[PDB]
Structures are given as C-alpha cells and as structure tokens.
Point group: none
Chain length 260, copies 6
C-alpha cells in the first residue's frame, strides 16, 4: 500500500514507518492517520524485517490527538463519535501492546499527549536533543491515554509521573531521558545518520535473539498494559460523551488557536 | 478546633497544616495522628477538589515521637505496641484509600514516618533546603508507610536500600532525581509559589483529577494495602520485644539529630 | 579452601571474594558457580548479619566462561545445555532465595551474568572506575539473571533495552543514576570506605536487617522465580540450537576483550 | 421503572425483573439500564442484601436478539460498540456489587440470563426451572464471564457441554454442577424463598458484607478480565458479516422452548 | 512429648494425631489445644513418617473455636485479646498450609466452624456416613476462617460455598462428598478399622513420591491460601475487636 | 499423513485422530507413538476442520506410558533417557495446551496414567459407560504428569484429586462425569453411533465461534498449565534418574 499520511520504507533487516501527515498539521492524529498507522504496523508485523523504525517527518514528532478535528464530531454527535473515537485509540494502543518485533522510535521534535504516551510502548526511544515531551491531560480536559497511567509511574515514580499527568509539565529530551521516557539522546546535526547507523547495527543481530529479548521482557507487563488501556478508554468514553468534557475540549481548541 | 493542626477551607481546596503542640518538631504521637486522620476524613467529604498537606516550623515532620513512645512501651509492651501499630496502619491506609489528590508541601526535614508517607501522596513539593531520611536501622525498626515497596518502586531496590538500610539522607534535589520529590521550590518565594500552584491545580476539572488519580492508584492499591499490613505486623513483633524496646531506648538516649 | 573464591568469616558479616584460578578475569564456569553456591549456603547458616560479595583482580566478573561452555555444548547439545542452564538457574535462585542482605563490592567491569545478578543483591557499591554491560545480542543469547524483569523495573523498558538489546556499557555513575548501582566511590579510597561502611551495617540489629530484606523482597520474589525459569527455558532452546551454538562459537573466537 | 419492580423491605431490597418492553424477560438496552440503576440504588440503601427475582413463567431468556439485530443490521460498527458497552457495564455492575445477591430463579434462565447467575452469591431455583447457554446456536462466544465461571464451578469439560454443545440443565442437575445452590419445590417457591431471605436479613450487616468481600476478593480481577476479553471478542463477532448473519438466522428460524 | 488434649501415635510409616480434648467439651479449640496441635504437627513433620493421620476421639470430631473460652478473654480487653486469638488461629491454619507431608483426616462425628474449614487444608478427607459438616459463621457472628473463603468456592463453586458460609447449612457426609469437602465416605460399622487398613496401604508407597505429589499440588495454591488466611484474620480481628462482634459472640455463648 | 499407530480421518467439518497402536499393547504410549500424535495434532491444527475428535480403536482408550519400553532405556542410561523421556512428555502435553481448535475425546475403555491425565487438556470428553479412569502414580512410583497436579484439583477439589493422584482410585464413567472429568456418558450399545452424530452436530457450528469459545475458556488457565507442565517434568526428571525411581518402575514392570 501507499498511504496519504505516512511513508513506509522496507529495508533489509528493518522496516521504516514515517509519520508524515497531509490531512492534519504537525503530524496530528485523526481517525484516518491512526488507521493508516495500525495498517502499516500490521503489515510490518508480517514482512521479513527483524524490527521497525518509527520516525516522523518535519518539525514536530507527533502533537497527539487533533482535538480541533474531533471536537467538531463530538459536537455533531457525542455518543456515537466518542464510541468511535475511543475504539480507534484503544485499537491503536493495543497494536503497540501486541507488537512482536522490537520497535525503535526516533523522535525528531515535540511529542505531545498521545504522541508522547505511546513512546513507552516501544522498545527504544531515540530523541533529538531539541525534542521535548508533554502529556497535558488536565489542559485537554481528559484523563491519561496510551497506558501512561501505569507506564509513567513505573519508569519515574508516581510523584514525578503526576507532574506530567496532572501538572502538565514539559520535559526536554535530556530530562525525559533521566526520567526513563527517552533511552538515548542524539546531537541534532547528525541525528538521522546516527539513528540510521545504529538501526543498521541492530538489524545485523540474530532475529530470534531479538524477538526473544522482547518476548521475555513483555511477559509480565503485557496484561497490565492491556488492562490500563481498557481502563483508560472506559474513562475517556464517559468524559468525551459528557457535557463538561466536550466543553473542555472546545475551550482548549479555541485557546490553542488564539495566539499570534 | 485542633491542638496540633490547622485546617484552612479555601476555594477548590482544603489545607491541612501540621503544627504540633504536644510534640517538638512536628513529631507524631497517637494524638497528632488522630487529628490528621479526622482532618483527612473531613476533607474527603467536603466540596474541595484536592488537599494540600503542609507544615509549620523549621521541620516538616521528624516522624514518630520515640521519646513519647518508648515510655509507653515500657509501661505495657503488648497494649502500647498494638495501639501504636494500629494507629499507624489506619494513618497509612487513610492515604491509600483517599480519592482526592493530595499535594504535600515540605518546608523542612522529613524523617522516618514523616518521609515514608510522602510516596502515598500525589505530588511532593519541596523547599530546596528540605532533606529526607528514613533511618529505620538507627531507630531499630523495619520500614513503615509502605516504603518497603514504594521506595524500591520509584528508585530500584539498591538506591531504596541506601535509604532503608544504610540510613542515607537526600537533599530535595537528590530526592527529586530519585523520585521522592516531584518539584523543588526556591527558598525566597516558597510559600507564595506553593499557593499559586495549588490554586491553579484546583482550577482543573474535578472529575478529570479524580479519574486520573483513580487510574494511577489502580494497579498499586492492593500491593500498598498488603505492604501496610505486612509492615505493621513486623513492627508489632519488633516493638513488643525486649530487643526492640532496647533499640528505641538506645536511640532516645543517644540521639543528637 | 576453595580454588576460585576466598571466604572471610568476619565479625557480624561474611566476605565472599571471587578470585578465580580455573578461569580468567573471574569468568563463571560450572566449578566457580558451585563454589559460590556452597559459600552462600554456608553464609546463610552462619551468624553473620549480612554478606559482602567482592572480587579480586582488575575485573569484577566478566560473566559466563563461554570458552569453557562452548565445547561442552558442541559435544552433547541436549544434556549439556540442560546442565549449563540448570547450574545458572540454581546460581540465580540462590540469590533470589537468600534471606540475609547481600552488599556487593564492584572494583572493575561486570559483564553479562556478572552484571545481571547485581539487582538480586541488596546494595551495590561500585568503584567510579567500574563499568557494567549485558551484551546479550553480542553473545547470541536472550537475557539471564532475571534481567528481563529487573532492568526494566529499575530503569524503565526503553533504558533497560539499551542494555539488553543495544549492548551498551554503563559507567558506575550512569549505572547509579539508572538504579543498578547504589553508591559510587572514588578509586583512591574505595576498598577502605567499603570496609568501614560494611562494619557499620554489621553493627545494626540482626532481626531488623533480616526483616528489611524480607519486606522489600516480598512482593517481587515470585516474579523473580518465574523470570529465572522462563529465561533458562529460552536459553536451553537457543544454546541447543544450530544458530545459538554458532553465535557462541563465533563470539569466543572473534572476541577481543575491552576489559 | 417500566421493566422492573423494586420492593425495599426490612433488611433487604428485592428487585423483580418484570419486562413490558420485551417478552419473557428478555434483556434489551432499556431493561439493562433499569437493572443497573436499581442495583446502584440497592448498593446505596440500608439493606443488608439484595433479592434478584422475576415475574412470569420465565426468569430471563437473555439478550433480546430480535431487538438487537435490527440495530446491528442498520449499522454494524456503531451498534456493536453500543451493544458491547451496555453488556460490559451490566456484567460489571454484578462484579462490583458489594452486598450479597440472592437470585431466585422461577423459570428458564437462558443465555445471558443464565450467565449472570454465577455473579450472584446464592442461586435458588424452582425444580421446574432449567438452564441453558446456547451460544453456538446464537452464533456468539460466551458472555457474563461464563468463559471462566462455568469451568471454575464444574470443570472445563462440563462447562463446554453448556458453552459449546448447548445442553440444557434441569434445576437439579445445575445444582449438582454448582450453578444452582438450592432447589425448591414448585407450589410455594416464592413463600419459601421469602422466609429464607428474611432469615438471612436477620444476620449482622457487616458479617454478611465481609463474607461477600472475602469471597469476591479472590476472583474479582479475573472476572473483570474475563468480561473485558469476552466483550472484545463479541465486538468482533457482532460487527462481522458472519456474526450478523448468524443472529438473523437465529431470530428468523425456530422459536422459543420457554 | 506428652499432651493433655491430643494423643500422638508414631506408627510404622505414619504418625497418628488424635484430637481428644480434656480442657474443652466436644473437642472445641482453645489457645492451649491449638498450641498442642501445632506442636504435634511440627513433630510429625520432623519424624520418619511418610504421612499423617489426623483424627479425633468422642462423639464429635471438632466443634471449632471454644467461644465460651474466647469471649471471656475478649471481654477483658478486646483490642489485645482479638489479636492474640487471631494470631493463634492464623498460625494454626498456616501450619496446615505449609505442611509438606500428606495429611489424611478421618472424621467420625460433626465437624463445625474451624473444625470443618481446616479439612480442605488436609490432603484426603475420610468421613463416617454419620458425620456432618457445618460452618455457621453467620450464627457465630464472624466472617470465614481456615481459608474457607477460597477453599469452599474452589471445590463447589461460589453459590454452593455460600450455602455454607452465609446460610450456615449442614451437609451430611454424602452431600459433603458430592461437594468435594469429603473425599471418601465409609459405612459406620467398621469405620475405624477400614480407615486403619487404608492408611497402612498408603504408607506402603514411596515417601519421596508422596511428598512430591503433595508439593506439586500445593504449589499452585499455596500463595492464595496464605493470602486468604491473611485477609480472613485481618477481618476477624476487626470484627472481634468491635462492640458488634463481642455482642454477637456474647449472644451466641449465652444462648448456649 | 501415513501413521503406524494412528488413523487420521480428515472429515467434513472435523478431523478424527484414532489411536490404534501396534508397537505397544493396549494403546500404550512410547516415544514414537507420542511423536506420531504430536505430528497428527499439528496437521489437524493446520487443516480446515473446525474441531478435532480424538478417539481410540478397540476396547481400551489408552493405558498411558509403556513402562516396559521406558525402563530398559532408564536402566541403560538414566541421565540421558530421563531427560529425553521428560522432553517428549512436555512437548506432547504442550501440544494439547497450545491447541486452538476444540478437541472432543471419545473414551471407549480404560484411560490410565497419562492416558487419563491428558483428558482435562481437551474440551469435551465423551465416555462409554463401561469406560473407567485411573492415574495410579503412586503404584508406578512417580509424581503427576499431564498437568493433573492442577487440573484435577480445579475440577474436583484437592481431596477428590488426591484420591486419584495419591490413592490409586478408579472412577467409572459415571463417577468421572460427576467429578467433571467426563462431560457425557453414553450407554454401551450405541457409543460410536452417538459420538458420530454429535460431532457432526458441532462441526455444523460457526468455525470462528468454536475457536473463540476455546480461546476464551483456555485464556484464564494457559500460563498455569504451562507452569504445571514444566514443573511436573522437572520433578519426573529427578525421579526417573534416581535409583529409587528406576527401582520403582522396574518393580512395577516385573509385577
């Protein structure tokens, strides 16, 4: 397949999946982009690669959900649109939870909201030093997504995780790395060649050793991730179908656009 | 009316301030614990969105008042160690069961039970001059406040044992890096800043705040409960023994602080 | 007397010092493992309040002696990998089951099994010059020592995989920031600070120390047991396979020690 | 409430399934949300326990497939999402319920009407009632956590005779298999149930609730996990062409044995 | 070692522990009786037996906790006494949980309360047809003990378990056998000789095989039992340290 | 698709595997018969049947492991042979654990040791009324196999499980049905007739539905079964490579 909003590049030993949106700005996630992503992942699961590189094109890595888009739909019909909304997010998150091959994610810029919370679901997080990370859930008017309700407290402690989850604090690549969110930081000048050279190193390893490393790590966390996803989504379906949650989303979008 | 605490009902939040009169340095006796639990029970049932837990004086909380407790253990070992353990369990569980977010503001040193309760709260705000220690092996006790699981969870077992076994102190900056503290505040503007930040938190959607806490507390709650009971059972055993009382007396007669 | 370790029964603590003769740079063969288990079983029964696990020489423990195990696998794959995997499993379980606190002293590189057993101990005291690696992808192996769960628990999944999959080395200070090491020492005063702090710990209440260990280890023990079993099950599969034998044969032959 | 009758009494609240928007106490969306509402009220009131019973000749024939297949056939995607959401939340209300629930079974319990019974605490059945979970006849995988609760009370082989083979159990054989906990004679079923409920309502409220809590304790998470997995599967079956097809076949062909 | 409330017999291949109380009626359990049992259980763990036979003398196998005894102590100081009471129960129950050899329990009279809830902790339950079984906790005014909050639902399903735990119903030996509580029912006439024949048969088996069958079975459920015992005792302590809980026990003992 | 010891029938909606040994007595299991079953199951898994029917030919179902076969091997080389034996049992048992389609088992006569202990790993168990069941591990001189150390207590309680596991108890088809080991009992005259009617009934059901019921029911117990299989095999390895274990089997075979 060729995609509207993503580019896929099949190499020997690895498959590249590049978020490069056209129907949204700065790699925002709407329904269509998400189904393309899940589609590219499913295919990458089945091809002859040993691992996947998840990267993004342009300025930001992923700004998360496109609330400007979703708020129109929930305003039009909140009970249908939040069912669909929440079902596509859950499916998205589970695609990461279920993925058998290692996923290296390569972060070129800002990762926000759902663009940030999916990161812990991959196997290696490689950040450009100029990227920063935020899950401003309380600004959005939603509770956590992407299993960040367990993965953040697990990697940074509950207090530190709540600084992101409740207080909506941003983290530089180096702060995210210290808190476990990011596993390696790269100098900006040579980011993509350095990522390219390290990815090819990983692709030269035994495929079975790679799958087994990931399988063994994934054993005693997978059911926790499944449940967090299920629990988060249930909560989001009741918030996004509520009068306050819609209003909150509206309020957020009107403010976001109101700047010079 | 409260002898050892102050309760301030503010817009969207309730402030409980530790300010002891029956103890020095905000130390915890059974009486002080009782007040805090009741204050917390009241705050949970009121129309605030969250609780700010802070303290007054040079110290945040130096933990259990062992000078007070050792006297009671020497009177009646079995009664006093049991009441002591039962009141701690209840104290700890109140934090574990609490549905509203609790922000804790630490303006000075937090020692022993004063530091182990902090992981049970939602955010930990610390003055840069605050420091942290759980010198259980100096006291002559095993962990309290669930710290036997919470410390290993935030910092890994080794770093956690540096505190639990080796009795190491952490600066607010070191604690922040180790996950005990979530934000360090500058000394000059400490109280005004904490108040600005709590008010902004109290401006957030109440349901979003509770759901968020509910989703986080969710896969840890039973472990916390199990750990609280296990911790308290070991403490009752230690504090009812001659060896345990001897340790407490050693600490009270030898301590310099 | 042991041919690969020195045991110093001391006042309130027992020292187990890895100092192999049958292997180079404190590598682990079947004999070395067996002695360690012996010493740890004896130390579990003495009236020491705690164990200090140290080493002698320039390296702490470079992990599995692959030059030793490779011909042993090349001979009798099925039984030999069972032996090999069972002796590791037992070595690892001994740490998991140990009731007394273990303080480990690291005065050089800990590589592979030499590094993955550290999270099973209680305090990790490292010379600033010590470094840490689990280069599993280079060995041709899946994780061992329960590192499949312990590493992601202390440092998070992604940071753990930098070690487990990407084969990265950590300095003492970096290992400390990531949970693996609990105290870094200056090289000049390392062994003397370690001795004075061990004796301070040996002066604490024996019951209190045993109870701190029990409560901390409590909600993680079955996870460790299950992860050990699961990892050994996979290692039997890999080391008894054509490609896993070759990977080991390739490593011990191509390897040029950076320690 | 259109479809249920609540009867608070001394020490216990009775909730009677008595549908008028459906036949034979079938569960449609309306009926389910009334039941959840009534259960939530019962949780908040001063009763020590709940009696869940039914009016008419059938206890509950489960999902009203005639009602649901109309919705599924319009919009597979949205209707299967809504449908699974309402069942999950129904089932979850039983899972989370803190007071003992005694269920009084007066007639056939079928499909979801039998799969909820193990989520209650005592099951008292008329000797003339029978039990069936004909999932393979409907064309669905199990619901109500019966994928784990049936194997747990009677072993997997016997559970699959219900779940796969579609076999009926009399009240007596359901009793031997642990699904029913007491069988009563038919003539004065309601009189005898009522005296035993009054006996149970004489017990300490805290003791009753601690007994519930200590049992539900061991199994609550497994129940939530089974509910979750089943609903995931049903979302896939009911939004598929095979699934809709199976449900229409069922609705159109052969009518009721209750 | 001599005991006042139990008789221990070291036979060839098995040890027989007989509950035969002198300080209680109907083989009721008070602190000292429980202590003597834990002691004889530890001794039998250590001896050369392949397995233990657990039985009782008299018309009643075991009527459970001696509430007359305990209520006196709880009256004095409920706080302190409920802990002591709950800790000796926990330890008793844990002694069965951790026991590594097979225990065969032989029941020739009513087993009531704690007297019945320990049976699922044993390995084989052999009962006279005239034996019956009851856990009338709601009559006592307590929540479950002996791990019965998980052992009864796991053997009979939750609804059937609650007919015992909540409704306090009695099961005949036959009914308890159909429910998995009893594993073999014997006709009354030659009950003890029949039991003795069968225990010697079991003792003929390889000791390691016997210990290994037990360890592999117990392995899957050991934590759950320990946690059940933990929760149950925590709840019993808060019931027996309350006004309501002492009232319940007072009423029960007075009515008697 | 050719087998010495089993007849496979790729039928309409279902595949029937018939145990009919020649290399052993009474459908007994040795390395080769076990390896044939595994291959035949793996093939059934891959074909377009919606379910598997596991039957046996003649008057006995399966008397379990052939100890006359195995004990010569153990005596010859206890370490190698006890490991080989334990590895093939593990893979056989795991084949049942991991199986995605329902398996109906048709039990025509006695099921003994591993012949009875695999029964709980299947989904439906239909027994001729004259069929009986035993797992006499304490007579063989071994610990449990087939996951029966967890599956027996989960279906019947721990006490009734040890009647079988420790006490050598034999269940009639009726008692086994009452204990949850058998799901249906069929009167003698009409066993094979009825089994065939009923399996055709089930093969008329939706394939995905059948596979989903199996996946949902297995879900909850999968890891426990795997851990029990691993655990049992470890202990058996120990017993079968010990003098007392070899002594036990030898005695059993001589008697």
């Amino acid at each position: 397949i060729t995609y509207r909003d993503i580019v896929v590049k099949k190499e020997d030993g690895f498959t590249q999946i590049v978020l490069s949106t056209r129907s949204t700005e700065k790699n925002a996630l709407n329904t269509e982009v998400i189904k393309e992503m899940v589609n590219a992942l499913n295919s990458a699961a089945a091809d002859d690669s040993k691992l996947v590189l998840f990267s993004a094109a342009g300025s930001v890595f992923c700004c998360g959900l496109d609330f400007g888009y979703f708020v129109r739909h929930l305003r039009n019909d909140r009970n249908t649109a939040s069912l669909e909304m929440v079902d596509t997010i859950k499916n998205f998150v589970n695609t990461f939870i279920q993925f058998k091959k290692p996923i290296v994610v390569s972060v070129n810029g800002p990762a926000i909201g759902l663009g940030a919370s999916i990161l812990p679901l991959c196997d290696l997080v490689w950040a450009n030093e100029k990227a920063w990370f935020q899950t401003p859930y309380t600004t959005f008017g939603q509770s956590p997504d992407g299993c960040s309700s367990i993965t953040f407290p697990k990697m940074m402690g509950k207090a530190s995780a709540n600084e992101m989850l409740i207080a909506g604090r941003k983290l530089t690549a180096r702060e995210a790395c210290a808190k476990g969110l990011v596993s390696q930081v790269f100098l900006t000048g040579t980011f993509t060649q350095e990522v390219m050279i390290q990815i090819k190193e990983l692709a030269s390893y035994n495929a079975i050793v790679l799958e087994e490393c990931k399988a063994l790590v994934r054993c005693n966390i997978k059911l926790e991730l499944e449940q967090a996803n299920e629990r988060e989504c249930e909560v989001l379906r009741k918030i996004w179908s509520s009068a306050q949650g819609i209003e909150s989303m509206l309020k957020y979008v009107e403010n976001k656009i109101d700047e010079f």
